[PDB]
Amino acid sequence: SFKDLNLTDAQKQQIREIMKGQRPLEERRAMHDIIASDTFDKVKAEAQIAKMEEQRKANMLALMETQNKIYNILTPEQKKQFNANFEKR
Amino acid sequence: FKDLNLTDAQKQQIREIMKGQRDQPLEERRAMHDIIASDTFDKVKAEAQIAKMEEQRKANMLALMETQNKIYNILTPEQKKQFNANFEKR
Ligand SMILES: [Cl-]
Ligand SMILES: [Cl-]
Ligand SMILES: [Zn+2]
Ligand SMILES: [Zn+2]
Ligand SMILES: [Zn+2]
Ligand SMILES: [Zn+2]
Ligand SMILES: [Zn+2]
Ligand SMILES: [Zn+2]
Ligand SMILES: [Zn+2]
Ligand SMILES: [Zn+2]
Ligand SMILES: [Zn+2]
Ligand SMILES: [Zn+2]
Ligand SMILES: [Zn+2]
Ligand SMILES: [Zn+2]
């Protein structure tokens, strides 16, 4: 139901406004090099984990802004279903 | 069990490894709920929730990769190859 909230036509348009507002392979190659090795190089692993911190930040920002904007187009009835869904995931 | 012709005892060692680094309750994503379910979006608080989440992401990626590296190193040369091939497709 994470998307089943009885959206009105206006809300469906609004979500599309919104996602126009907010619209990892070299990384997995680097994880592979750390996994496929006869030892575990913790220092190298930490540097790999960190390397795309900024792209991850911008990505999570966009998604949280998106979800907050969608939340705010919802009626009270719909907000409670969204929140109850949030609690169970 | 991914068609690697894992032997029976490779199957068991893998279980000891999985539960071994399982000796790691994670965080409180209640914070993130409160950012999303707010009249206004607070970018600075959202950035702080993200940076806090980086710390648990680091801990869980370190665990996952170390666990996978241990598994890799109980494999034969030919199994390593099919493990590497299978890694490419996921
Ligand atoms: Cl890869
Ligand atoms: Cl929550
Ligand atoms: Zn209609
Ligand atoms: Zn590329
Ligand atoms: Zn690879
Ligand atoms: Zn590589
Ligand atoms: Zn070596
Ligand atoms: Zn460290
Ligand atoms: Zn950093
Ligand atoms: Zn930054
Ligand atoms: Zn914005
Ligand atoms: Zn809260
Ligand atoms: Zn603030
Ligand atoms: Zn260790």
Residue numbers in the entry:
A (entry chain A): 28 to 50, 57 to 122
B (entry chain B): 29 to 52, 57 to 122
Question: Which statements did the authors publish about this structure?
Answer:
Spy is one of a group of chaperones that allow clients to fold while remaining continuously bound to the surface of the chaperone. We have previously observed that the chaperone substrate Im7 exists in a heterogeneous, largely disordered crystallographic ensemble while bound to the chaperone Spy.
However, other indicators strongly suggest that this ANODE anomalous peak also arises from iodine. (i) The height of the ANODE anomalous peak is the second largest observed in this study and, at 26.4σ in the phased anomalous difference Fourier map, is substantially larger than the signals observed from zinc, chlorine and methionine sulfur, the largest of which is 9.3σ. (ii) The position of this anomalous signal is structurally inconsistent with expected zinc- or chlorine-binding residues, which would be required to enable binding with a suffciently high occupancy to produce a strong anomalous signal. Thus, although the 4.5 keV data set was not analyzed for this crystal, the strength of the signal and its chemical environment are inconsistent with it being derived from zinc or chloride, making it likely that the anomalous signal is owing to the iodine in the Im7 peptide. The larger peak heights for L18pI-Phe and K20pI-Phe, compared with each of the L19pI-Phe peaks, suggest a higher level of occupancy at these positions. Attempts to perform traditional model building using the residual L18pI-Phe and K20pI-Phe peptide density were unsuccessful owing to the weak nature of the electron density, as well as its somewhat amorphous shape, which is likely to be owing to multiple conformations within the peptide. Of note, the electron density for the L18pI-Phe and K20pI-Phe mutants has a substantially more defined shape and signal strength than that observed previously in other mutants. In the case of L18pI-Phe, the molecular-dynamics simulation used to generate the conformational pool was found to not sample positions encompassing the iodine position in the crystal, preventing any fitting and further analysis of this signal.
